[PDB]
Amino acid sequence: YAQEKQDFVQHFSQIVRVLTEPEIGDAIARLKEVLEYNAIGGKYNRGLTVVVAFRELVPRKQDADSLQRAWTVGWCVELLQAFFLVADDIMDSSLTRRGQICWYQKPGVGLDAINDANLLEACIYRLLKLYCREQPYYLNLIELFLQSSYQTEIGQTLDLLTAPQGNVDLVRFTEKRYKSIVKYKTAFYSFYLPIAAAMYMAGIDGEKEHANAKKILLEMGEFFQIQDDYLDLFGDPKIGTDIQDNKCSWLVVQCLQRATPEQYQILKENYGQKEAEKVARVKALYEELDLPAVFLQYEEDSYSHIMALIEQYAAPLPPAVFLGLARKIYK
Amino acid sequence: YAQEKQDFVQHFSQIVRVLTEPEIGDAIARLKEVLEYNAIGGKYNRGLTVVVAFRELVPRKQDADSLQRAWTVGWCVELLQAFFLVADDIMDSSLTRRGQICWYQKPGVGLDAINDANLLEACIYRLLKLYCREQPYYLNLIELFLQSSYQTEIGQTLDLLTAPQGNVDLVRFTEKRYKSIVKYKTAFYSFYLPIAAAMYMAGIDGEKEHANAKKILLEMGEFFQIQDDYLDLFGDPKIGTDIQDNKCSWLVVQCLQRATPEQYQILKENYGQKEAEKVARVKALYEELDLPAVFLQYEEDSYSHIMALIEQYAAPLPPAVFLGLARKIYK
Numbered sequence: 001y002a003q004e005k006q007d008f009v010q011h012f013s014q015i016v017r018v019l020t021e022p023e024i025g026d027a028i029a030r031l032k033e034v035l036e037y038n039a040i041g042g043k044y045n046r047g048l049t050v051v052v053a054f055r056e057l058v059p060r061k062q063d064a065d066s067l068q069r070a071w072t073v074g075w076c077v078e079l080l081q082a083f084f085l086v087a088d089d090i091m092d093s094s095l096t097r098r099g100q101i102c103w104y105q106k107p108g109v110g111l112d113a114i115n116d117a118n119l120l121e122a123c124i125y126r127l128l129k130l131y132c133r134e135q136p137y138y139l140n141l142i143e144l145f146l147q148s149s150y151q152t153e154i155g156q157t158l159d160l161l162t163a164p165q166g167n168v169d170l171v172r173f174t175e176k177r178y179k180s181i182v183k184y185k186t187a188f189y190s191f192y193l194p195i196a197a198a199m200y201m202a203g204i205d206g207e208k209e210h211a212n213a214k215k216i217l218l219e220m221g222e223f224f225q226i227q228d229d230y231l232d233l234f235g236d237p238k239i240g241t242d243i244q245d246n247k248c249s250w251l252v253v254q255c256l257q258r259a260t261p262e263q264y265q266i267l268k269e270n271y272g273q274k275e276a277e278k279v280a281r282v283k284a285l286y287e288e289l290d291l292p293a294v295f296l297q298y299e300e301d302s303y304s305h306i307m308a309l310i311e312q313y314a315a316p317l318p319p320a321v322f323l324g325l326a327r328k329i330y331k
Numbered sequence: 332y333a334q335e336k337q338d339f340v341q342h343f344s345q346i347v348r349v350l351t352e353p354e355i356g357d358a359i360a361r362l363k364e365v366l367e368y369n370a371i372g373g374k375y376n377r378g379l380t381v382v383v384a385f386r387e388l389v390p391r392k393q394d395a396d397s398l399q400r401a402w403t404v405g406w407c408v409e410l411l412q413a414f415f416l417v418a419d420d421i422m423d424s425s426l427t428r429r430g431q432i433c434w435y436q437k438p439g440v441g442l443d444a445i446n447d448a449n450l451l452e453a454c455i456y457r458l459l460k461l462y463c464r465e466q467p468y469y470l471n472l473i474e475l476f477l478q479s480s481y482q483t484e485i486g487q488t489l490d491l492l493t494a495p496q497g498n499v500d501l502v503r504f505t506e507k508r509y510k511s512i513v514k515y516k517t518a519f520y521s522f523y524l525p526i527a528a529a530m531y532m533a534g535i536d537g538e539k540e541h542a543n544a545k546k547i548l549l550e551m552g553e554f555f556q557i558q559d560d561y562l563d564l565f566g567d568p569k570i571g572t573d574i575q576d577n578k579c580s581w582l583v584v585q586c587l588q589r590a591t592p593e594q595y596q597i598l599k600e601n602y603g604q605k606e607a608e609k610v611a612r613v614k615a616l617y618e619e620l621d622l623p624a625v626f627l628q629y630e631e632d633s634y635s636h637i638m639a640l641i642e643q644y645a646a647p648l649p650p651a652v653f654l655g656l657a658r659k660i661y662k
């Protein structure tokens with residue numbers, strides 16, 4: 001798996017070579033700089049998942065070119081990721097990303113990052129064309145990536161309406177709403193997309209199979225994010241900033257369901273300010289509501305429920321496809 | 332033509348209806364607001380051109396559904412336009428657009444406009460799917476719109492490298508470069524895209540025919556922009572701001588080819604400042620170099636050359652497809 005990871009990373013150089021072949025040379029040079037800064041330095045889990053799932057699904061239809069297409073579509077997933085991140089960082093006014101200055105914050109990039117991010121998106125379909133245009137699943141993959149982009153965008157919109165950074169409102173933060181943001185903004189592209197892509201590459205194109213896989217994978221994405229929000233605040237540290245940013249965090253959502261009217265007010269006064277004594281006091285209200293424990297409870301039920309989902313909906317894909325993801329997430 | 336224009340506009344309401352069908356309802360409401368503010372209020376020439384060209388190309392394969400698909404793909408062109416404009420306005424820090432406050436400048440939109448613009452792009456492929464997924468040209472159209480987006484982005488990058496607003500450099504402003512910016516940023520999507528789309532809808536999918544049409548239409552896009560840059564400064568007024576913004580304008584490009592070293596300096600000191608006496612003095616240097624006259628000369632040659640292009644490359648499409656565009660532009 002750490003070995004697969006370095007093969008996946010080593011293939012990047014070729015991705016960049018093929019995307020970067022007279023007077024537009026300067027544009028293409030800037031494209032290369034954008035690729036290199038923004039598509040590298042994550043953990044590569046989403047793109048890798050394409051490759052791993054592709055191997056588990058397919059073994060005597062794995063010639064070097066099949067493999068090369070799998071690495072490439074994995075790279076397409078990472079590019080879609082990069083597009084989202086560069087754009088989200090600008091929208092959120094973030095400072096850092098992946099251990100570096102966010103791209104838009106580099107001197108001389110600024111809002112030109114909007115176009116750079118568009119270029120990252122565009123690169124997905126260039127690669128798909130270059131490597132997959134002859135394949136029976138080509139159109140299936142173009143449509144998967146487009147639908148993933150739309151779901152992710154539509155979730156981002158929902159998020160932005162829900163949690164405007166700099167304006168405290170908690171009547172927006174409902175369970176139904178939290179779950180809707182996670183599904184659209186995060187789970188579809190992070191969980192469904194990579195396995196779905198691998199399924200199509202493997203010839204598995206049926207609506208029912210895809211719907212079966214989606215059921216499991218969206219539910220995994222919900223836990224993954226819920227765990228993310230818990231760890232943001234209670235992890236062993238990268239200290240998080242979710243309460244400082246008026247996020248629609250699973251933590252705050254539970255808080256609000258579980259709170260007396262006096263506690264509602266303690267949240268009103270401290271959710272969103274930058275002051276560490278103000279951040280200290282929501283955290284302590286979360287501890288007073290035993291939210292680490294509700295999470296622990298939540299993690300157990302969620303795990304049971306996922307395995308029931310896999311039991312029920314995995315067939316006829318190898319359960320291992322799902323289990324390896326469950327393994328990674330439920331760590 | 333003004334009648335066709337109002338039918339085209341009246342179809343918008345339906346476009347919006349079909350794009351705007353539980354908890355993501357709020358996102359979809361915001362999507363509607365984005366569509367309504369940003370896809371309306373232009374002249375609709377690019378989208379209309381799809382419809383007009385579709386009628387000229389196809390008459391006993393024009394059932395109500397064929398027509399509805401043509402209006403829709405026209406709308407897809409306008410959406411691609413809207414995506415570009417909303418994003419470009421943010422990148423350029425523009426104030427107004429189409430007689431209104433630019434979307435990003437509306438209170439409470441701000442940089443959330445980045446996602447709204449992504450949503451406009453996404454809507455293109457939703458409509459294509461909704462209306463064209465069964466058609467033989469479906470994939471041809473998805474790929475056309477993707478390639479148009481890429482060309483436009485790659486040209487925008489070239490522009491942004493060439494003309495960084497707030498930093499005077501004129502060694503960048505070369506003929507070869509000007510022409511490269513116009514082709515990628517403007518001509519492909521403005522001229523090739525709508526006719527190309529109409530060609531595919533009509534069954535005309537050959538690489539040679541498309542390459543023939545492209546030759547004419549890219550050359551029209553070059554003139555159209557060159558005329559734009561001339562009129563920006565010398566039009567009968569919407570007063571333009573190109574010299575105030577250090578644009579790589581056809582005017583400045585000619586100036587620089589035609590200038591003594593002393594005049595180079597007069598340009599160094601006045602290209603880009605906001606001061607109307609400073610803007611007054613480039614304008615007057617353009618008049619002193621008889622650039623209105625070089626343009627007039629340029630417009631005549633360009634017109635001859637286009638008609639030679641149509642003569643040579645139109646067949647077997649009806650020359651009228653091109654001529655109506657030439658008519659509109661050479662007004």
Ligand SMILES: Cc1ccc(-c2sc3ncncc3c2CP(=O)(O)O)cc1
Nearest residue numbers: 043044045046049190191194224328329
């Ligand atoms: C498809 C998929 C696979 C793995 C992840 C994980 S496992 C993990 N462990 C510690 N920290 C983060 C993660 C992630 C999320 P990330 O790949 O770093 O965005 C997320 C999605």
Ligand SMILES: Cc1ccc(-c2sc3ncncc3c2CP(=O)(O)O)cc1
Nearest residue numbers: 299300303323324326327328329330331
């Ligand atoms: C392949 C695989 C997937 C998931 C597990 C996990 S994660 C978890 N979290 C809370 N409780 C139980 C589990 C399990 C089953 P375990 O008791 O570690 O073998 C173990 C192995």
Ligand SMILES: Cc1ccc(-c2sc3ncncc3c2CP(=O)(O)O)cc1
Nearest residue numbers: 374375376377380521522525555659660
């Ligand atoms: C395909 C196409 C058709 C028409 C245009 C024209 S004609 C005209 N006349 C005055 N002012 C502008 C124009 C345009 C450009 P625009 O449709 O307003 O962006 C541009 C492109």
Ligand SMILES: Cc1ccc(-c2sc3ncncc3c2CP(=O)(O)O)cc1
Nearest residue numbers: 630631634654655657658659660661662
């Ligand atoms: C269909 C049609 C297309 C173009 C023309 C134009 S635009 C132009 N600009 C400079 N010189 C000539 C032209 C012509 C030919 P014209 O002499 O107006 O009939 C006239 C009709």
Ligand SMILES: [Cl-]
Nearest residue numbers: 063064065066
């Ligand atoms: Cl092969």
Ligand SMILES: [Cl-]
Nearest residue numbers: 099100101102
């Ligand atoms: Cl850094």
Ligand SMILES: [Cl-]
Nearest residue numbers: 394395396397
């Ligand atoms: Cl029909």
Ligand SMILES: [Cl-]
Nearest residue numbers: 430431432433
């Ligand atoms: Cl207004």
